[model samples]
Target: ATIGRISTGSKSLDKLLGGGIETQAITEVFGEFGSGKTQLAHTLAVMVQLPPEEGGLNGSVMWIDTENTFRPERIREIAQNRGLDPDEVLKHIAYARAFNSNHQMLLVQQAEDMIKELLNTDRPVKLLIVDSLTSHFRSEYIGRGALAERQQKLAKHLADLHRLANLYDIAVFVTNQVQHILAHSATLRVYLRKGKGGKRIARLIDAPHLPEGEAVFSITEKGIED
Candidate 1:
């Protein structure tokens, strides 16, 4: 029904994540600042565009820019590294910035239709990235009293994400700051960390079908490397 798993551009990480990131599922990578959460997402964004033999889905991408982390320069660098046409690769990605929590929710609905629109096209959307998926909700609902309200809304938001992932057979990649609600919402959760010697560590915290393990990788100008 789908391309199935999209490579993350790191062999060790792909192994740690049980072959690669899965379609029809939500993968959440959470970490502190500079832990390479966005870096990994950016790498996957490009990786998902390559041919199936090279671990891609051979499709386009849709990115929900929650914190302005969608960088064209990075995409260009990664595309060039893979010897793909940078311009064409850039064109394949549809970008949208979420102004607020409600807007982000609305965009999820919009994305469902957009992906459907591409069903007959050559490059149907294979990946959806919400870099820093929890920023808006974390800031918008600040106090303890609002935690209950935010969690309720958060469930509804994730419900839509899950539905789209299943319906479109797309890999849903979301970066969260960390929350119990997301622990259950996400089909897989990896905790990222900035390690010594300029390396990053990805620890598998939860998954539907995978053992717990950790992988170390470096972020190069091109993308992630084992």
Candidate 2:
């Protein structure tokens, strides 16, 4: 049977994401800038470190920072406010800096090796977050000629995340950016939630496990304000 996962907090959002994010799957969160996507990613980075009883995986987090949006200090503060140990919370997360698409994919490919080193030394990584997966690809490769190749590369990277999630029995979260599509007589923008593989990954990620509806949320000083 397909398993399910939960977010660190935010009940409302969790319900939309199938009661929580899915473990052993790659979940994608895509929206425009300031859409609270990255904020949610950072929050999960801290929350996933909570003990299992507290709606967390009780595992370490691997943050793949493509846009440099990770803030450990902010994460600590949020943890403290949530009544969690700040230092301990931070200890459960590992950071890997990826400045470009190639770098990002390489990091993902080597995730198992890195995780092994950490696990052998007694660090357990339970979650992986790719904050803004489309940043470098969107900027580096443009036009129709590069779209197919770009998507192919992305599919491979995502497959790696999926394998890692299932192999380790952990949760995987990825954030994506959106582009504007011109509609008849007007311009409307939509978030890119799926790639060439169709909704299989989304279902595998269990995002479609949510009740049939869209979820709206925002980021504020107190964290994940509805």
Candidate 3:
């Protein structure tokens, strides 16, 4: 069976992702600080509300703001730049601020509940954004002493997301701060970083059949651009 894809709001990046990120897949966008990780997620919150012809899924988003990086104002501005109603766009993006590791894990479970709750509604929830997925796990589990426990828990959390994605055909997008466990779980693991002169770069670190290369882009108020 074939599922659809959603644009990343950047033409070049979309091309790099082969018609945008696909459903039934968990995409991990990881990078250092100030690498446009959250910004891209913000733009997707806006883009997912647009119609398919506009390179969107015509659906809503479920965002787990673990690092407190989910900004509605950016969504508003990005929506306006994309020629859509700012307020109405934000209405569709369900934002959740996760407090701790346990809270973050539980949020995904409730996210699945929401997905079920929204089934057959006007706009189905198609995208899940967990910005900075590694914070709580990293902080809670200190050093090699707790590495096994942390890995086990983190892997379980990732497995939960993967199951939801496959079950509901939802496109899962999580921004990570690093790993073998994550690299294997994610359908596509993109390593993003900053370039000189307001430009950001992305490389598909762990992807199959896609070009093993880099993509250069920039983040502006209008969203991501080439």
**Top lDDT model:** 1
* Model 2, runs deviating above 4 Å: 1-4, 117-123, 180-209, 216-222
- Candidate 1 positional error at 112, Å: 1.8
The Cα error of candidate 1 at residue 146, in Å, is 1.2
Residues 125-209 of candidate 3: C-alpha lDDT, one tens digit per residue? 8899988788888889987668778878988999999998899888899888753443256788889888789699888875668
For candidate 3, what is the lDDT?
Answer: 0.84
Candidate 2 TM-score to native: 0.80
Count backbone overlaps in model 2: 1
Q: Which is the winner by TM-score between candidate 1 and candidate 2?
A: 1
Worst 10 residues of 3 by lDDT: 177-186
Q: Which digits, one per residue and each the tens of the lDDT, describe model 1 over residues 39-151?
A: 88889889999888989988889999988878899999999988988899999999999999999999998987789899779889999999878899998998868877888
Q: Which stretches of candidate 3 lie over 4 Å from their true place?
A: 178-184
Whole-model lDDT per candidate: 0.87, 0.66, 0.84
Candidate 1 runs further than 4 Å off: 178-183
Tens-place lDDT digits, model 2, residues 62-147 = 88898778888888778888888888878777788998889998898777876676664444777788887778887888887887
> What is the overall TM-score of model 1 with all chains considered together?
0.95
